[PDB]
Amino acid sequence: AEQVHLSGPTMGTTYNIKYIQQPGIADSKTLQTEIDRLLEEVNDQMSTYRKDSELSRFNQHTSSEPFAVSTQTLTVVKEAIRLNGLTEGALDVTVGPLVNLWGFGPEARPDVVPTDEELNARRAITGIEHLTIEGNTLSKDIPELYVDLSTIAKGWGVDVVADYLQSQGIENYMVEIGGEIRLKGLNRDGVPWRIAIEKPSVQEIIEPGDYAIATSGDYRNYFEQDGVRYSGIIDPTTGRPINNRVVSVTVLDKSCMTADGLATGLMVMGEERGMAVAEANQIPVLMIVKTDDGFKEYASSSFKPFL
């Protein structure tokens, strides 16, 4: 088969799109110009790094009056609220002020650790309860609420590009943005698209079929000294970077937006409560956990068939 590869910058990372050419398909340059327009739009709606994005303008809004947003932004926020419910508070897109405090957002930070008083002041302006939606509108009940969609708008971008390839008659694709992946159909060799799971480096290749895959963390954090764990993933209950022994969480779901949110959420819950949610909701999840004698893999019932 003829496999076409498109690549470009978005969201402070890169995209890689592979697809199998077919008779009557639009040319690669037409498709790429539209892919770049759609991804610029995801950035102009939902990038916290763009001061004039819809999301940043909501973040700068001080009043509790409903703030009108695009249907795309509303869809992503609506899914973040549903995932907050599913992960019992662990996925909370209102931790923006803590993400920024700890040095993982657009805010310029020193290498000095926040004081207890600085940390408690940011914790006070976080909580999913401050955020409500109504039609294509968002509302904040405290002026300083800062919503961060970094954990989910990446998967959303993958879904937008995958829907656009489907809309152009392309049934055989891999869409990847910053390691968030969506697959359909068959690769160059007429086999199901191949993905590697990295283990403490050791690589197992799986075939998810028609599915999205998201991973939080990677294998390398396993080799780091003991000490306060370095992480851009915040535990909303402590206001601090997570400090559990979960190395990586991989999730499969038909939506890449959903996989991306779940992988981060279940990682925050930790393996005992995270694997119970995965079992209760038939989520395909693979967790790598660090132990004293090495690492453990926990595969959910619905992940095991891919191994």
Ligand SMILES: Cc1cc2nc3c(=O)[nH]c(=O)nc-3n(C[C@H](O)[C@H](O)[C@H](O)COP(=O)(O)OP(=O)(O)OC[C@H]3O[C@@H](n4cnc5c(N)ncnc54)[C@H](O)[C@@H]3O)c2cc1C
């Ligand atoms: C639209 C968009 C534009 C971006 N533009 C830039 C850019 O210009 N420059 C740049 O340097 N980076 C940019 N980023 C990247 C962003 O700052 C994060 O680094 C990135 O999204 C990391 O995602 P991940 O898949 O690596 O990690 P994931 O595990 O998927 O998510 C981690 C992120 O979720 C957020 N978060 C942490 N804890 C929680 C929690 N408990 N609940 C909810 N969310 C939480 C934080 O932002 C954290 O970085 C952009 C991201 C998006 C989505």
Ligand SMILES: [Mg+2]
């Ligand atoms: Mg995520």
Ligand SMILES: [Mg+2]
């Ligand atoms: Mg992600």
